[PDB]
Design a protein around this ligand. Structure first.
Ligand code: HEM
Ligand code: LKP
Length: 375
């Protein structure tokens, strides 16, 4: 009773793909070579030609979901490398048909947009060095990078380690809703203290970012390859997916608003982050379309259950209010620390070279979390 079945949420890894596939069938060896040698092919300036000189491979040889997730990540990384190139200005506004058609095919099959997404580069872009050793940074590695010294391993692994840390709270969600219907007051308080404990533990995981991500490398390099073609001046009308669409289609770039973890606690605790017409709420709602289907289904199914904030508010129980508030406080702590990280990794490098609009969105989301406190 957690239903890792219907909503595809693993007990230890959570929204992450449990044990992602490292290699694709030999049929797709031409795809795998490009994706694995992206730093070299970009630096040498022969990535684009090597992509242009590909044959349209059929997505029919991708049998299981794991291989379909790998190919999504493989083609997603190739697309970002093709579009952005060296990342200095020369942008390709047309994705070749031999890449654009199979990518769009597999994208429709997995109900995800044809752009690199959080679920590709974080949830499915990992492996454990020794399978018998635990899930720790030191025992882990990413499958794909963009450039040498892009700090993508540190960026993707720390996001994943945070996502895994938060999974420990997702398994107590059924207990929260059942304790509410059965009116098991003490169980609900204990369940809320357990969620708060897990979110407090996930804050220490964030600390690891400083050890494996450099401000200059993230801002001047990594940031470029995660950028998309929705509201982007250097791709005004979007990107053309050759032989699939007639018109250039606009797709949003990489966003952690695509992480189901933070969105599900915002829903669970009844923090009005999606409710309203404002930019912040609209953006977070849009990013749900960039999540795997089972995961966006879990978020609306949580919305379909009675409110935890309203239940706690309906009772003159200080102990239940304190437990609920510990969860909210743990979320404000994560977002307050995250705002400090964004100052180091975006605000300062930008000053030594937009960023204010990103700061406003984050401060608003944090504000909304802060205002959800009962007191
Ligand atoms: C170098 C470190 C990091 C930087 C520079 C960074 C930057 C940003 C920026 C600029 C945003 C603005 C909105 C967007 O994504 O479109 C954002 C949002 C977000 N980031 Fe990070 N981030 C970092 C690390 C992390 C990590 C490790 C996580 C863990 C999962 C994370 C979780 C989030 C979440 C959940 C959001 C959505 C806003 C919210 O719900 O508060 N970020 N981040
Ligand atoms: O915030 C965006 C980046 C986004 C993101 C990925 F994309 C991939 C993996 C993890 C994360 C993450 C953590 N916290 C924010 N994120 C960033 C992308 C480039 C844009 O130009 C500016 C926003």
């Amino acid at each position: 009773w957690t239903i890792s079945k219907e909503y595809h949420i693993d007990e230890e890894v959570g929204f992450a793909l449990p044990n992602p596939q490292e290699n694709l069938p030999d049929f797709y060896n031409d795809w795998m070579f490009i994706a694995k040698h992206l730093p070299d092919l970009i630096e040498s300036g022969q990535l684009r030609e090597r992509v242009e000189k590909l044959n349209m491979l059929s997505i029919d040889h991708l049998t299981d979901h794991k291989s379909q997730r790998l190919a999504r990540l493989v083609l997603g990384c190739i697309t970002m490398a093709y579009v952005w190139g060296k990342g200095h200005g020369d942008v390709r506004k047309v994705l070749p048909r031999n890449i654009a058609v199979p990518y769009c095919q597999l994208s429709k099959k997995l109900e995800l947009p044809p752009i690199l997404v959080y679920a590709d580069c974080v949830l499915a872009n990992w492996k454990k060095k020794d399978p018998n050793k635990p899930l720790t940074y030191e025992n882990m590695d990413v499958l794909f990078s963009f450039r040498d010294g892009d700090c993508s391993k540190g960026f993707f692994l720390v996001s994943l380690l945070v996502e895994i840390a938060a999974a420990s709270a997702i398994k107590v969600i059924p207990t929260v809703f059942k304790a509410m219907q059965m009116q098991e007051r003490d169980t609900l308080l204990k369940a809320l203290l357990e969620i708060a404990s897990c979110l407090e533990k996930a804050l220490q995981v964030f600390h690891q970012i400083h050890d494996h991500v450099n401000p200059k490398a993230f801002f001047s390099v990594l940031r470029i390859y995660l950028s998309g073609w929705k509201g982007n001046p250097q791709l005004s009308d979007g990107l053309v997916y050759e032989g699939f669409w007639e018109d250039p289609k606009e797709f949003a770039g990489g966003s952690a608003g695509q992480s189901s973890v933070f969105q599900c606690f915002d829903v669970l605790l009844g923090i009005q982050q999606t409710a309203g017409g404002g930019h912040a709420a609209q953006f977070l709602q849009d990013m749900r379309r960039y999540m795997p289907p089972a995961h966006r289904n879990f978020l609306c199914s949580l919305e379909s259950n009675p409110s935890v904030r309203e239940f706690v508010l309906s009772k003159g129980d200080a102990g239940l209010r304190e437990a609920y508030d510990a969860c909210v406080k743990a979320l404000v702590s994560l977002r307050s620390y995250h705002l400090q990280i964004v100052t180091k990794y975006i605000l300062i490098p930008a000053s030594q070279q937009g960023g204010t609009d990103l700061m406003n969105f984050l401060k608003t989301v944090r504000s909304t979390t802060e205002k959800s406190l009962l007191k």
